[PDB]
Design a protein around this nucleic acid. Sequence first.
RNA 1: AUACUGCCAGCUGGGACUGAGGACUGCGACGUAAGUCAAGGAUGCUGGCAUAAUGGUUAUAUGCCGCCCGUCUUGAAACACGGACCAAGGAGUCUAACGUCUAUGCGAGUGUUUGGGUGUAAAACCCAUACGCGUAAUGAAAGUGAACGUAGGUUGGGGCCUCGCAAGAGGUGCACAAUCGACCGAUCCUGAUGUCUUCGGAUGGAUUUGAGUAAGAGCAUAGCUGUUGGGACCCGAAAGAU
RNA 2: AUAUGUAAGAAGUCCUUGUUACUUAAUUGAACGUGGACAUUUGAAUGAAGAGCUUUUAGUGGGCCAUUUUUGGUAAGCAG
RNA 3: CCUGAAAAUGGAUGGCGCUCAAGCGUGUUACCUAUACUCUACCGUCAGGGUUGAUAUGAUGCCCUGACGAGUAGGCAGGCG
Lengths: 58, 185, 159, 49, 51, 148, 222
Amino acid sequence: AKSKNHTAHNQTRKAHRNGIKKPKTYKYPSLKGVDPKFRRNHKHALHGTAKALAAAKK
Amino acid sequence: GIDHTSKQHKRSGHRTAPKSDNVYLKLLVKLYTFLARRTDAPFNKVVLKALFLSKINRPPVSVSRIARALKQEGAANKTVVVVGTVTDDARIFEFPKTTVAALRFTAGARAKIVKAGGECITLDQLAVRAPKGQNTLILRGPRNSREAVRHFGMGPHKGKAPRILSTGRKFERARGRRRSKGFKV
Amino acid sequence: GKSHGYRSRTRYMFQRDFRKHGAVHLSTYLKVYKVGDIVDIKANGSIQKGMPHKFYQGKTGVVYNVTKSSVGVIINKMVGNRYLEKRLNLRVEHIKHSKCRQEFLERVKANAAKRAEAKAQGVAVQLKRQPAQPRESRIVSTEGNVPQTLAPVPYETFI
Amino acid sequence: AISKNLPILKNHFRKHWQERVKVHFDQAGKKVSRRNARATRAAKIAPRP
Amino acid sequence: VLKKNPLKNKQVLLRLNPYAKVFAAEKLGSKKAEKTGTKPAAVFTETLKHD
Amino acid sequence: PSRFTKTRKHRGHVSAGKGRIGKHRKHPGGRGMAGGQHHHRINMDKYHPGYFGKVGMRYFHKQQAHFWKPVLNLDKLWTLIPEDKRDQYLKSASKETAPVIDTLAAGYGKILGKGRIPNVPVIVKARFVSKLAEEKIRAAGGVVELIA
Amino acid sequence: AEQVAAERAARKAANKEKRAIILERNAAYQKEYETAERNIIQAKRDAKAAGSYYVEAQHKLVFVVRIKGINKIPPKPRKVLQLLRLTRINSGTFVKVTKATLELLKLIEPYVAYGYPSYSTIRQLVYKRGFGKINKQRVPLSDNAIIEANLGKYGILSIDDLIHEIITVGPHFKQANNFLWPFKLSNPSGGWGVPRKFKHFIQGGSFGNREEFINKLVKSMN
RNA sequence: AUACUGCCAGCUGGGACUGAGGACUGCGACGUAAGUCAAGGAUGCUGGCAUAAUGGUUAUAUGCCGCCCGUCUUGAAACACGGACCAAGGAGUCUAACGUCUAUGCGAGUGUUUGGGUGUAAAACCCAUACGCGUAAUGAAAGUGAACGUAGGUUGGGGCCUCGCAAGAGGUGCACAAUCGACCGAUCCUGAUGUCUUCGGAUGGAUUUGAGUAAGAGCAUAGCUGUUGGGACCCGAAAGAU
RNA sequence: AUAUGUAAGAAGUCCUUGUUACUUAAUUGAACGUGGACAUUUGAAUGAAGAGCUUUUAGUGGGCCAUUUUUGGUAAGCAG
RNA sequence: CCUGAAAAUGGAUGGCGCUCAAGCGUGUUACCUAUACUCUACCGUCAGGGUUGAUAUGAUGCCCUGACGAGUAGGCAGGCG
C-alpha cells in the first residue's frame, strides 16, 4: 500500500493565509552575540555618559 | 461574485457592553457612553473602554502605585483614576491627601486614603466633578504580572515557567534542562 | 539514499571564476565594515573558513558585529509563514559592500543640496522621484529623412 | 495520550476505585447523632462536666 | 433616498452643474470653428500615396 | 447546566464534532503518558523538558517540619505590629522604647532584607536573619536578637 | 435667539457664492478643453503644412475595466487587480499612465479591457456611476457638498472639478481617483461585438488595450 | 456635397419593470420679487366587485427540470455496505485532579460547612488557633536569599497638564513592548581585617546560568471549552483467569 | 526569460563636542549620546472595506485532477 | 474528398435529419439566455454613526446608514422543543 511521498502543494497558500509579513523591527537591537570585549567597553561608556548627563542636568 | 481582500462579516475584536450583569456597572457604562459621545474629551472614551474591560485586564492598583504616580512632578494634585479596584499596600508608610476615583476600594486602601486626608470617589462622582477628565491621571495595574501569563509562549530557549503542579527536585529538572542529562532545553 | 550536506548542490555556486582562480586581491581585506553597514554575500570558494551557506549566497544583510577577521550579518530568512532573524559570522572574503545603500546615501545628499537651494530661492525643487512619464508631443521632420517604405519579404530557403 | 501545553497530572484511578467511594451524605445526620450522644451522656452523668 | 441620474433629470443636472444652463443656452455642444486653409506640403501627400 | 453544552448543539450532526475521517476512537495514541519517549517525545521535549531521568540525591524519611522556615521581608516587618500601636511607634521613633517584633509567634522562621523600613528603632526577635536584614535593622537603629 | 430664517438666508447667500465659483470654474474648464483640442488639431495641420509629422502626446490617463470573473486567477494578476481596485467583473478604475502603471496593466491584460477615455466618457461615468469613498462608505455624489467636504483640501469643490482633475491628470489625481469608488458598470448593452472575449483586442477578442475604443465599450456598459 | 468616425449639459417618439419612504428641515430650477416646480422615493382621475372575484390550501393535468438516502471514500445513482414496514427505547455522561477564558466576592490575603453552636430536625444561620494556595527565589545539597539611584537609564507610549484664532510645540508620562544596567540564588574566579593556621569570606569580578527582585495579585465559587485516569460517546472480538 | 536578496529616511542626513577599562603612535577610531540645521513634497507607484498581535482550542495529517516544467516506463484512466 | 480503414447484442455529429448544407475555412451583424453584471424591493450579518427628551416607553430602546451573504470536516452564536 504505497502512498504519496512529498509535495509542496497548497503550502504557499497556507503560508499566505495569515503569512509572510516581515519581522518586527526594533530600535536598540539586542547585543547578544556581539563581541564581549566591546560589550564591556559599552557598559563602561554608557555608565560614564549617564553619569555625565545626570551631572549636567540633574 | 467579489474577490474579497478581507474576511467578510468580521466582528470588531473589541469588547463593548461588558460581559458583567452588574446593573450599577451598566449604569456607569450608560453615563460614560453619553459622555464619550457628547464631550469629545479622550478621557471619557478611554474610561468607557476600561469599563468594558474584564477582570484580568483590570489588575488591582495598589496605593503604593498611586503614591508613585503622584510623585510625578506636577501630578501631586491630580485626581488619580483607576477603572478597577484599589488595593492596600503595607510596604509604604505614608500616603498623600489625594483624591482617587475607582470602581472598588478594599477596606484597607479606602481607610488609608481617608486617613491620609484625601477622598475615595466613585466614577460617577468623578464624572460629575470633572466631566471632561480635567486634571486626571489614569493608572493601570500590572497586567503581565499574572501567574497565568508566565506560562505563555513556553518553548525551548524561551524561559517561560513550565505548567507544573509539583515543584522541586525530580520534577522537570532532568534530561532537557541540564547538559549533564543530555541537553539543555 | 539521499544526501543533504552542508555544501550539497553547490558545484557551480562556489566555483571560483574563469581566469580568476587563486590568491585574492587585497582590496577585499582593506575594506572596512561598521555596524549597520549593508553587505552582499558571495562566497569565495577559495577560502573555506567562515564560508556562508548556499542559502545565504547572494543575500544582502546588515552588519551587527565586527571581529578580528570576520563580520556578523543579520539576514531575514523565510521559514514557513514568517521571517526569522539569522546571524552569520562571515569572512570579509565572502562579504562585500552593497551599492544600493550607497546610491541612496548619494541621493540623500542630493536632496539636502536641493532643499538648501530651495531655501535660498524657492523654485519648486520637487525632491521626490517620479516614474518614466508618457512622452509629450513632438514634431518629426523629413529633411533628408523621407520615409522609406518597407514590405514583408518573400520566403526563401537560404540553406 | 499526551497533548498540548498542560501540567502532568497523576490521577490514581487505575484500581476499582468505584467500589471504594465514600461520599459523606450522613454529615448532617451524623452531626445530629453526635449532639444527641453528647446530650444523652450529659443526662447520664448529669452533674459531671 | 433615491439616486437621480444626471445626463437626465435636468433639475439634478443644474443642481450639480450651474454651467449646464449656459452650455445649453450657447449650444456649446455644436460650436462652429473659424475656417482657415493651411495647405499641406506636397511631400506629405506623395508619401501617403507612395507605393 | 447540561443544557449549555455542545452535546446539545451536536444533536442532528452525524459525527458529534469528532470528524468523519479520524473518528472518536478509544485510545488512538495510548493511555495516559504512553509513549512519552517514542511518539509523544515531541510534546515532552517541547512543553516538559527535564521530565525523564533523575538528578538530585535522595532523602529517606524527609520531614517537612525540619525545613519549616517561612521568610519575612523588611517591607512586611512592620505589619506584625497591631495597627493601633503602629502609628504611635512610627511617630515616637526613639530607642529605649522600641517595639518588640517576635516573628516566631508571628509564624516566620527567617527574616530577609527586601528593603526600606523607616528609621524607627525596633527589637526584632527572629530564629534566623540575613546579613542585609540585620544591617538594615542596625541602620534603622533597632536590633535583631536570635531566639529559638 | 430665533435664527429661524436669518441662518437660512445666510446659508443661501454662501451657497450662491459657491455656485458662482463653480460656474466660473466650469466655464474655465470648458475653455481649457476646447483650447487643448483645437491646439492639437492645429499643431497637426501646421506640421503637415511644414512637411513634418506631429506626433501626438502619449495618453496620460487610461480607464480599465475588469472583464474576467473572480475564479481561477493566478496570484500575481490577482494581487495587481486588487491593487487596481478591480475586485469584481465589469468594475472600472482610472489609472495614471506611468512606467509603473504600464507594467502593472501589462500583467493583468488578459483579465481587463482598458484604453484612453475621453472627456465625454469620463464626465458620463462620473455623473451616472459616481460614488465617493467617505469614511470607508460608498456614498453617491449626487451633490457638490460632499465632494467639497471630502476633497476641498485639494481645491476640488465640485463634481466637474473632480472630473477635470481626473481628465487633465493633476497633482491631486491620486487623491481624487482614490476618493472615487470603483465604477460598477453593467454589461455592454449592445454586447461585446466579439464571439469570445478572452482573446486580445488585436486577435478579435476583448482584453487588452483598445486605445480609444474603450470609450465605445464603456459608454455601452455605462 | 456625401461617407466614416467623434461630440452635443441636441430635439421627437413607441414599450416594459418598479413606487421603497411618510409631521414641515436639504441642494436646486423657474421674468432675480411674494409663489411654483419633474428639486432628499406616486400621485390624480375613473370604473367593476365587495364576492370565493383576488388569493391560500389541496388533488390532478400540462411545460421544463428532478437517480436513494445514510456511510467510508480522490471519487457513490452505483453491479460498494445498512435499510420490508411502524411504534416505543437508543448512543460525549458523571467523578477526581487540572489548562485557557469569563462572571462574582473579598483582596496581601483568601477559603464558614473536618468540626463546633444553633435550628422552623439533611435546609438555614453563626463560629478559627489550624490547614491549603498565595505573599521568595535559587541550588543536587549544605545553604544563602532580593534598592549604588526619584525602584535606574534609553526608544516608543494612551491619558492628563501648559498652550497661540485653524499648525503643532513643550511637560508628565500608568499599562505594555525593545534595549542597556542594578539586586537575589547557582557556577567559575580574586581572595581583606581576623584567626579553634584552618577556619570564617569582606572586596572585586566573569562571551556563564535560574520557572527570580525591581510599589505585591491572589484565594474561593460558578460556567463553556480542552486534558488525563476511570465502562468513559454507544455496540462489537479471536482470547486470558478463577 | 521567469522566479529571487536588499534599499527607496525622522530609529534619517550634516558640526569646537561628551563617555569608556575597548582601539589608536596620537581625543586618532568604535559604539552610545547632550546641544544644533531640516514644514507644509519627510525624499518612487498603486492599494490599504483598520494596524500590532496574545491566549486557547477543533478538524486534518489516505488526497485527486488541469494548461505548464518534468523523472521512470513502449505506454497506461500508470508511478513519481 | 477518396484508397490505406478488420470484432464480435442493434446504435448513435446527442437524435431526427442535412448536400450552392443544417458540412469545412473565413468574414461583417442580428438574436437567445446563468444563481454572473447593472438598478430596485425585502431578509439577515458586519461596520461606522446619531439620539438625555416636562408625561407616552425596561438607551445595542428608537434611528441614519454603507458594504456583504457558497460551503464538507470543524468552531462559535441566537433560538425551538
